Ligand binder design. Structure first.
Ligand code: HEM
Ligand SMILES: CCCCCCCCCCCCCCCC(=O)NCC(=O)O
Length: 461
C-alpha cells in the first residue's frame, strides 16, 4: 500500500517577501527570540525559507521525540553551523556524522570525558573557582560584578587548564581576553551572515576582512597552546596528540587537531558561561529559590574547598542549573535531516535530505509536558528525573551527536554556583531588566549584581 501520511494539511509558514522568502522576518539581532514568537503564533511546526534554503522549526515534544530517532534522522549542519565550520572545520561540533574525522575524533576523545577523567579535572576546576571567589571577596564597597564577563573568565580558564594545561589568566585582565573578543566577533559575524541575501557584495568586504582577522587571533592562541605543550599531563590535548582511533589504528592529523582545539575552547566554555549567568539571574529574581539553594550549599560544602563527592551532593544546585537550561538553553537549537523519505508525526511528509530545526527554548515551554506554569522558574520540576518524558528536555542535543562535555559543564557549574552561594549574599541592585544577547548562543547582556561576603574562609587549592 501507498506509504504516505493519512492526512496532510497546509504547512504553517510566516509571511514571505518575494525572492527573499522569510528572511526579512529575522532582520534582528535576536533571531532565536523572534523565532520563538513565530512558534507561539504558528504552533508545533512551521516552514522557514531563505534564498537557496528551507527548514522546518519544531517546537513540540511530540514531534521532537520522533526527530530524535537516530534511525530516521541524523545531525544536520544548520546554516549557522555551516558558517562556524569555516573556522572550526571538521572539529567535533561542526563535522558531519559521516565525515571521516567525526567518528575518529569521537572515539579518540570520549575517554577524556569519562567518570575518571572528571574526577581528575576537579582540582583544576577548584583552582579557577577559588580565583573567581577571591576576585569578588576583593572588591571595594562601591563596586559591582559584571556577571557574564566574570563567568566567561571562569569558564574559559577552566577549559584552558583542564583540557590543555594552559593558563589564559583571565582574572589577571580587566578587559576580556583577546581570544574572547575575536571569538564573540566571529560568532556575531556568523549570525549576521544568516540575514545577508547577497553575502558576496563588496559591501561585506570589511566584514570578511575582520572575520579573517578574528580567525587569525583564535588560531594564534591555538599555536601558543600547542607550542606550550611542547615546552607532563594526560588530558584532552594529550589525547588529541597521541590517541589512536581504535577503528583506523591512527591518531588525528595536525589539521584536525587544530580544529578540535578551536572547537573545545569555544564549545567548552561559552554556553557554560551563559548557563551560570542565567542561573544567577534567576536566583536573584526568585529570592526563595536562592535561599533554599544557599542552604544546601551551606549544608554540604563544609570544607574550605569542595570535594568531588560534595559537588555530586549539591542536588538542588543541580536542579537550579537544569531549570535555567529549561528556560534558556544556551545553544538554543540543533538541526537534523531525514535519512530517507518519511512522515513526521503522522502528518508532515518529508523527503530524504529535508531539514528540521529543534527550537529548544520552545520545546522546553511545551505545556503538555510541563504544565501551564512553563514561564516560572521552579527547580522542583527536576526533583525526580525519572518523571520527565524522553526527549522533553534537550539542552545538550541528541544521541551520538549529543554534547560530549555535558557532565564537565554541569560539574563545573554546580561547583561554582555552590561556592558562590556559600560565600556570598547577592543583590540585584539595579533591578536588572533581562536582555538576552544572541551570538548563535544566548547570554544575558549587562547583567550586574553586588555580592556581600559572608566572610567564610577559603582553603588553599
Ligand atoms: C551548559 C553548557 C553546554 C550546553 C548547553 C551544550 C550544548 C550542546 C549541544 C546542544 C550540542 C549539540 C549540537 C548539535 O547537535 O548541533 C553540543 C555539542 C557538543 N558540545 Fe556541548 N554544551 C555545553 C558545554 C560543553 C562543554 C563544556 C564542552 C567541552 C568540553 C562541550 C563540547 C561539545 C562538543 C565537542 C560537541 C559536539 C559533539 C559531537 O557531535 O560529537 N559542550 N553541546
Ligand atoms: C565551534 C563551536 C561551535 C560553537 C557554535 C555554537 C552554536 C550553538 C547553536 C546555534 C543556534 C543556531 C540558531 C540559529 C537561529 C537562526 O537565526 N536561524 C535563522 C536563519 O537560519 O536565517
Amino acid at each position: 500500500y501507498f506509504q504516505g501520511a493519512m492526512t496532510i494539511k497546509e504547512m504553517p509558514q510566516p509571511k514571505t517577501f518575494g525572492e527573499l522568502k522569510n528572511l526579512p522576518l529575522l532582520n534582528t539581532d535576536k533571531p532565536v527570540q523572534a523565532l520563538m514568537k513565530i512558534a507561539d503564533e504558528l504552533g508545533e511546526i512551521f516552514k522557514f525559507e531563505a534564498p537557496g534554503r528551507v527548514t522546518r522549526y519544531l517546537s513540540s515534544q511530540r514531534l521532537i521525540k520522533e526527530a530524535c530517532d537516530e534511525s530516521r534522522f541524523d545531525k544536520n549542519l544548520s546554516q549557522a553551523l555551516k558558517f562556524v565550520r569555516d573556522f572550526a572545520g571538521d572539529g567535533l561540533f561542526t563535522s558531519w556524522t559521516h565525515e571521516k574525522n567525526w567518528k575518529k575524533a569521537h572515539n579518540i576523545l570520549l575517554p577524556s570525558f569519562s567518570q575518571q577523567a572528571m574526577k581528575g579535572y576537579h582540582a583544576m576546576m577548584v583552582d579557577i573557582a577559588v580565583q573567581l571567589v577571591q576576585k569578588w571577596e576583593r572588591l571595594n564597597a562601591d563596586e559591582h560584578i559584571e556577571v557574564p564577563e566574570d563567568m566567561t573568565r571562569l569558564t574559559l580558564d577552566t577549559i584552558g587548564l583542564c583540557g590543555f594545561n594552559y593558563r589564559f589568566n583571565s582574572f589577571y585582565r580587566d578587559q576580556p581576553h583577546p581570544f574572547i573578543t575575536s571569538m564573540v566577533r566571529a560568532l556575531d559575524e556568523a549570525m549576521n551572515k544568516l540575514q545577508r541575501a547577497n553575502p558576496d557584495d563588496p559591501a561585506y568586504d570589511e566584514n570578511k576582512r575582520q572575520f579573517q582577522e578574528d580567525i587569525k587571533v583564535m588560531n594564534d592562541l591555538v599555536d601558543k597552546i600547542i607550542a606550550d605543550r611542547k615546552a607532563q599531563s594526560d588530558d584532552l590535548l594529550t589525547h588529541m596528540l597521541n590517541g589512536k582511533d581504535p577503528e583506523t589504528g591512527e591518531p588525528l592529523d595536525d589539521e584536525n587537531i587544530r580544529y578540535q582545539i578551536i572547537t573545545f575552547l569555544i564549545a567548552g566554555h561559552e554556553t557554560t558561561s551563559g548557563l551560570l549567568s542565567f542561573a544567577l539571574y534567576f536566583l536573584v529574581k526568585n529570592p526563595h529559590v536562592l535561599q533554599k539553594a544557599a542552604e544546601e550549599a551551606a549544608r554540604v560544602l563544609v570544607d574550605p574547598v569542595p570535594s568531588y563527592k560534595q559537588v555530586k551532593q549539591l542536588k538542588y544546585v543541580g536542579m537550579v542549573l537544569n531549570e535555567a537550561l529549561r528556560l534558556w538553553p544556551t545553544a538554543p537549537a540543533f538541526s537534523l535531516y531525514a535519512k530517507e523519505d518519511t512522515v513526521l508525526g503522522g502528518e508532515y511528509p518529508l523527503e530524504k535530505g529535508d531539514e528540521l530545526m529543534v527550537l529548544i527554548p520552545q520545546l522546553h515551554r511545551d505545556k503538555t509536558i510541563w504544565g501551564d506554569d512553563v514561564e516560572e522558574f521552579r527547580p522542583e520540576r527536576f526533583e525526580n528525573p525519572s518523571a520527565i518524558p524522553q526527549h522533553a528536555f534537550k539542552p545538550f542535543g541528541n544521541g551520538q551527536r549529543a554534547c560530549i562535555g555535558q557532565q564537565f559543564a554541569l560539574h563545573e557549574a554546580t561547583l561554582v554556583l555552590g561556592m558562590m552561594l556559600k560565600h556570598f549574599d547577592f543583590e540585584d541592585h539595579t533591578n536588572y531588566e533581562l536582555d538576552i544577547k544572541e551570538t548563535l548562543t544566548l547570554k544575558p547582556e549587562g547583567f550586574v549584581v553586588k555580592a556581600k561576603s559572608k566572610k567564610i574562609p577559603l582553603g588553599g587549592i
